[PDB]
Design a protein around this ligand. Structure first.
Ligand code: DOR
Ligand code: DOR
Ligand code: ZN
Ligand code: ZN
Ligand code: ZN
Ligand code: ZN
Ligand code: ZN
Ligand code: ZN
Ligand code: ZN
Ligand code: ZN
Lengths: 362, 362
């Protein structure tokens, strides 16, 4: 007997197009999403060229409309030069992404004053998300308070960070956060097996105590999101390993395993992969869209999942219980039992739907 | 210039049918909802007969399908006799309502053990809401913890209650709450004008300090809901005044006024009247549904709003800014400028929609 879930939303994916299409492209990354029970993705802007201006967003929108198999929204990226220039296109994006730690030269911000400038100029009704680790979480929260608005913290990975966010929420501050599956299901204990190249990710894998703190503080976690960050095995195993794990195809099976073990409820999962993504990012419903999962099927994660061009996975060897059997997207069968059945270009930019515009005062 | 909002949801209304139809019926109460920018309502079970068993729910479902002009879900009510008997119909209801303070003899629970029995027997994946004032909030929270599940607290009205809920949330407990507009916009200062009969409501109007505490603790409030509780003026002004205020037609104008004054943002409002109701009660999206509001129009609330059969309002004389201009429900114009344009029976039971069933493990 299958369980029907609504269309799940991953608010943090790197689909690598334009400019890194050997790692992933819209077509392969959204095939991976559908196979993971995800029907809508928000794609990050650290592409080549990065999505830091209107022409780059226009290009990315067309590449996504032509290649995506599930629905999507595209983030804009903050740069040292673009504060105050994005107002005409801001509402067409998923939100604004700030990279506040290590990143591409083009997305590097060298001063907290540049963070303030973005918080002051980006339209106040639209989402801002930040890659902000350790004390950077507290720093960006301060900027958000100085500018009197909300912030969403990407991939919280540490006891330190979740407790800081917990304390901020206890003070009524408008902050939300997400956690990625690798920070719930992998730790330092796995670095021996992964090795130093494959194991490179940012935020880095935490201690057992970090992992346990995230689980204990599930109530503080608003969303799950994969931070699907595909790189090829050659890259991960080479001399300058880029950080990141692929994760679209493994996220939901890992979390369904946890549900089956009573570590969180089905509702807890659906708040974090459906309702809270919708409400934080003002993402629209998808009509006639659902995911059918089999919660009894036990399997072992293989050395690579079928669809991501990353062609490797750090979860290899983990035993999971739960599998995606069928996905229906806007009335069409999109995935059954290992076969994607919608072509590149079936997916649409949800920010162009009437119901996908973020409401604002006139 | 109008602002387009999504279809708003009121999770706490009393529509009086069956058995109190001089006060309101499905057709008049849902006309009032549409005129208030509400496209989906959850109707409480304290009707005559009360919705405490499968035959009463079946009757109410047909009366609602024939009379409702907007979409709806119907609550079941807990009684001293029905724990363990509702499992076959539970999933068809909005949730289970517990009346833990004053109420009808049929909904009266005389022992906390009866509360426990309901929390133990009602399906664990389905909503439970409680009318729980003052220390009763803490008592029902204890029952929820003993039975390891969530609870939603209706119409929080006091500093004491919002601070208790705040403390529970800080401990990661699964509790949500709603606040009604009369507890944000009226206080003891208004009892002279209202008089002792009109002013009767449960929870009673709070002090200025209660009202200020609710505003200061907006972050703790998950939903707004009217507790639309229509009674005629003859009843409110008579010898045994029943408690309650009509509120569907005034809720959104009062809250839009507050948005225009910067007391909360448009997003804060939409989280509380759309996203959080959806996610707490697992209510489905409504396709091609939206509300157009005019935020500049200043008007004074009259002695009665056009649609509720209550034919009075405690907000008479308050100056508001914001008005509902047009409502579209599932592709049809449902309301324009004082005229309801969908007939009784246009509305549907959202729990019968495939997307409106609450997900559960097999
Ligand atoms: O911050 C980031 C970005 C990402 C990428 O590869 O794009 N991979 C990571 O591990 N962390
Ligand atoms: O608890 C309740 C119920 C309600 C009603 O009239 O049905 N009116 C109130 O004022 N409080
Ligand atoms: Zn990141
Ligand atoms: Zn993120
Ligand atoms: Zn990322
Ligand atoms: Zn929204
Ligand atoms: Zn009540
Ligand atoms: Zn309620
Ligand atoms: Zn009520
Ligand atoms: Zn739901």
């Amino acid at each position: 007997k299958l369980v029907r879930l609504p269309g799940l939303i991953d608010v943090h994916v790197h689909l690598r197009e334009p400019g890194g299409t050997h790692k992933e492209d819209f077509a392969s990354g959204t095939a991976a999403a559908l196979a993971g029970g995800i029907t809508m993705v928000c794609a990050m802007p650290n592409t080549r060229p990065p999505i830091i201006d209107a022409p780059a967003l226009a290009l990315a929108q067309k590449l996504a409309e032509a290649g995506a198999r599930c629905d999507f929204a595209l983030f804009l990226g903050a740069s040292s030069e673009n504060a105050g220039t994005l107002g005409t296109v801001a509402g067409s994006a998923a939100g604004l992404k700030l990279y506040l730690n290590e990143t591409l030269s083009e997305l590097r911000l060298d001063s907290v004053v540049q963070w303030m400038e973005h918080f002051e100029t980006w339209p106040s009704h639209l989402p801002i998300v930040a890659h902000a680790e350790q004390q950077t979480v507290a720093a960006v929260l301060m900027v958000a308070q100085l500018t009197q608005r909300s912030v969403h913290i990407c991939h919280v990975a540490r006891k330190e960070e979740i407790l800081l966010i917990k304390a901020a929420k206890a003070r009524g501050l408008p902050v939300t956060c997400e956690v990625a599956p690798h920070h719930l299901f992998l730790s330092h204990d796995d670095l021996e097996r992964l090795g130093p190249g494959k194991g490179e990710v940012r935020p880095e894998l935490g201690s057992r105590q970090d992992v346990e703190a995230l689980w204990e503080n599930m109530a503080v976690i608003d969303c799950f999101a994969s931070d699907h960050a595909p790189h090829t095995l050659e890259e991960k195993c080479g001399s300058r390993p880029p950080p990141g794990f692929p994760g679209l195809e493994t996220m939901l099976p890992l979390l369904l395993t946890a549900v089956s073990e009573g570590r969180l409820s089905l509702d807890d999962l659906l708040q974090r992969l459906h309702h809270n993504p919708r409400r934080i990012f003002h993402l629209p419903p998808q009509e006639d869209t659902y995911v059918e999962v089999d919660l009894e099927h036990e399997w072992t994660i293989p050395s690579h999942m079928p669809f991501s061009k990353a062609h490797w996975t750090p979860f290899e060897g983990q035993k999971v219980k739960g599998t995606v059997r069928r996905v229906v997207l806007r009335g069409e069968v999109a995935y059954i039992d290992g076969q994607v059945l919608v072509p590149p270009g079936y997916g649409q930019d949800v920010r162009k739907w009437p119901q996908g515009a973020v409401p604002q005062l006139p």
